[PDB]
Design a protein around this ligand. Structure first.
Ligand SMILES: [Mg+2]
Lengths: 97, 106, 95, 87, 95, 106, 82, 97
DNA sequence: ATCAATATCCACCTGCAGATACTACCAAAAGTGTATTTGGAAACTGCTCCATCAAAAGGCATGTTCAGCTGATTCAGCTGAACATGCCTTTTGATGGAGCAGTTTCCAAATACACTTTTGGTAGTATCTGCAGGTGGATATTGAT
DNA sequence: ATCAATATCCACCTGCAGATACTACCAAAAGTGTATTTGGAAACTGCTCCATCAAAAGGCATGTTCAGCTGAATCAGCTGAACATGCCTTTTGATGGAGCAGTTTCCAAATACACTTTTGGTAGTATCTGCAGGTGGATATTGAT
């Protein structure tokens, strides 16, 4: 039974996703969270579909960019596995804290 | 009657740029060369990006520039990238980049 | 049925100048339009501040010029200015 | 209106596979199992801030609908400028 | 010779209300003044933007409030609004 | 005659704030209450920072606020620190802080 | 005893900055890296300030030229006007 | 004969310079650097005394804040010695690179 | 553990740098009054586009396996902190003049206004065309051996 | 290196969403021409405050020593990738209807000037004191034993 070595599909995936531009979070699930959070701010709110779509393009962009920063932080610690400390270090320097 | 764009030799609307500088509440008065210069820069920058975007569209064997090609144009260009340093291009993706340490073997 | 203004006809014009065999998705155009809107606000802004700091109630192409040298990086600034200078110069004489 | 379902725990809609892909687009090869909760946390903060600002724009315009332009202005306000979804 | 306005006397008045026996160094007052100018420019900036987005020609106290809510942190935003409303209410209800 | 600042119960000049709002090219028109509100907001904030730097001077056995005090006041308060998160107070130094992994082992 | 101007930002000076920054141990290579960094900071800030000076048609770079440049680089500074 | 251990004075200095607010570059050698840098932008310039001060205040503040992030980076890699890569990592995540 | 060297703390002292109170002024706000211009709430109704639901299409969760990564341990060797002072670079104050800033001035270019032409959007109906995503079918890449 | 399992890469291929085309009109631009105001360059000029330097100050470049920190090397445990398996959830196309936004009518409020009053900023004067340094003498920290 044939198997790929750990890390080989991963770099396959990276080659693939850096190529494509499609959003990576499922639409509806992301729509729900937007709605749940907004509700907590204010009730009976409605969302132009392109508002949600703005918010997803925005967030994914933000999260992806953050993963690069995160990934650089890991490599600094002479690792290849990103950890919450790497996210945390990235965000502190960024002035998000 | 000859339009002010053609007067200044621009495809971009000098009329409109003049008008938008007024409602925009930037100053009390808007000089005559202000919108001409502004239109000229605005025209220049968009020409600069479309030249580059067009290439990324050709490299990709496509005829139509999509947001990926815009993103590829800006990001691969030092001076454009800095200008749009804090700007996100919807549906543009990222530049292919894998850090060396992640590649296999040695 | 209110009218929505954009630089789309102008962008396209300039698109055919550079690549006459190349079209543009309405989305790329949608971005190309934001880009001109964005850069407008930014140069206008600096010009706006620039005048205030000099007790000037007028933005002349000179303010647009320092605004451009402040805003745009290195070689982009250098070329924009030239085109601005060129267009203003070709405007002054043509009436 | 007759009955509108309760929204809760939707953050778990941001699945492990979805987060992974994002990290892959980020160029991430290996992901510690604690990341997905941490990313979810971070995304929650992100949205909360953009939405608070967006909604504020909505309410100032006395609307009940959060417009695409509401979000676009909230984004430029926080220095996360977005092209492609309006003015 | 020319007049150079400041917030200094009004900052100083407020200091005396808050800490009657405490003074302020020149440099600290120059920072205080800078701060007041900064926040004014920010809030007016936002108030300006709100008006535009809604196609309104007036900057009203409603604008200034939404501007405050967008710029200031929670407790600081809340208290500011209460002080902002309180002052607008007192001023109105006085012949 | 009676000042709009005394009418609002404020120390901060409503008239000046109104003046500066007009000549500031922010919109075509300035509403009557807007400068009152704004003056209040600015005043309040001025009081908040002088309060904390007042205490910051007291803590350090002092009676005159120097820049240092204003810096201790801002950076030690979570909300003021966020508002001034991208501002530098001249001659303010930094908060006493050493990373606990740099401390000598006991 | 000719010496570079940037080298005027001495090791003990750079160390004191590092100290206020709470740095305990400093690699020797830092002092050259830091000097490089300071050069980029100043070029960027000065370029913009001088650009304000030229617009005002002046030969003297004024504190406001600097303060404004600082504000526009996003490095707002209090205590010198504005 | 008497000698303090490495890192003991360092700590003593950290504690000292965080108490004070006086600038830590000598005025003159700085001022020349300022002028030398400006000469590439315009010849025969003059500098307001307060203007060089504004520039110093800002440069020092900047650098001191940069060392903080640099130091958080060195610690992240499980070190206590700030190295050029730490400054570089701090800067890239900030956006400066 | 003690022991001595020296860093650090604090109470008291005081000249003077930098804060503060005090006066007569005048240009310039800020306020008061009346004439005018308008911006936006209000109330009404077209109609876009949002919530919501039903069918249909595809990525999600989950358990198992073990590859190789992380993190601990150890260790050697390199590399940066500590040290003392006269050398030389900066700081301090003294004095010439550059140029910024305040003043008056006048015209080239700003605004205002008013009919007169142009044109950029849309709107309704049309045809054109680039390419997404299906197909197979020839060419790598990877990892077992 | 060689064999085989499967990813990858084109290349053409037919449907069709999205782009392109033009025809009709039309409100709102942009234009043009002229009467009317003025912003700011220009030119002169006074007096800060800036470049310079002489003497006074006091920080740092130096080169030796070894404490201890970095980075290599080694390895045990177990975490996270790969993948198979079984199906739930999202996606996608379709239909009444909330609220947004287009237009119109109407006034409380905001702007424009003028005239009356005042306030804040300077300035020139002397008037005042908080606290930076210096001191002395107790006590804590560090490093050695
Ligand atoms: Mg809830």
């Amino acid at each position: 039974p044939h198997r790929y070595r750990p890390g080989t599909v991963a770099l396959r995936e990276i080659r693939r996703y850096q190529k494509s531009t499609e959003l990576l979070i499922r639409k509806l699930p992301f729509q729900r969270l937007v709605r749940e959070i907004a509700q907590d701010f204010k009730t009976d709110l409605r969302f132009q579909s392109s508002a949600v779509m703005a918010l997803q393009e925005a967030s994914e962009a933000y999260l992806v960019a953050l993963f690069e920063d995160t990934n650089l932080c890991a490599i600094h610690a002479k690792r290849v596995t990103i950890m919450p400390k790497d996210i945390q270090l990235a965000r502190r320097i960024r002035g998000e804290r | 009657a000859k339009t002010r764009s053609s007067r200044a030799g621009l495809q971009f609307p000098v009329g409109r740029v003049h008008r938008l500088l007024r409602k925009g509440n930037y100053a009390e008065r808007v000089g005559a060369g202000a919108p001409v210069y502004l239109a000229a820069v605005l025209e220049y920058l968009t020409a600069e990006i479309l030249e580059l975007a067009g290439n990324a569209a050709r490299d990709n064997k496509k005829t139509r520039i999509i947001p990926r090609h815009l993103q590829l144009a800006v990001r691969n260009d030092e001076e454009l990238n800095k200008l749009l340093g804090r700007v996100t291009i919807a549906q543009g993706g990222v530049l292919p980049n894998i850090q060396s340490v992640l590649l296999p073997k040695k | 049925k209110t009218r929505k203004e954009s630089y789309a006809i102008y962008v396209y014009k300039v698109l055919k100048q550079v690549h006459p065999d190349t079209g543009i998705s309405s989305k790329a155009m949608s971005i190309m339009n934001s880009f001109v809107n964005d850069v407008f606000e930014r140069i206008a802004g600096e010009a706006s501040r620039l005048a205030h700091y000099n007790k000037r109630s007028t933005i002349t192409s000179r303010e647009i010029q320092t605004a451009v040298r402040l805003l745009l990086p290195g070689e982009l600034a250098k070329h924009a200015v030239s085109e601005g200078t060129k267009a203003v110069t070709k405007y002054t004489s043509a009436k | 209106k007759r009955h509108r379902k309760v929204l809760r725990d939707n953050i778990q809609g941001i699945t492990k596979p979805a987060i992974r892909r994002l990290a892959r687009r980020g160029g991430v090869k290996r992901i510690s199992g604690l990341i997905y909760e941490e990313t979810r946390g971070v995304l929650k903060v992100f949205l909360e801030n953009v939405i608070r600002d967006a909604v504020t724009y909505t309410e100032h315009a006395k609307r009940k609908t959060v417009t695409a332009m509401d979000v676009v202005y909230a984004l430029k306000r926080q220095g996360r400028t977005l092209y492609g979804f309006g003015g």
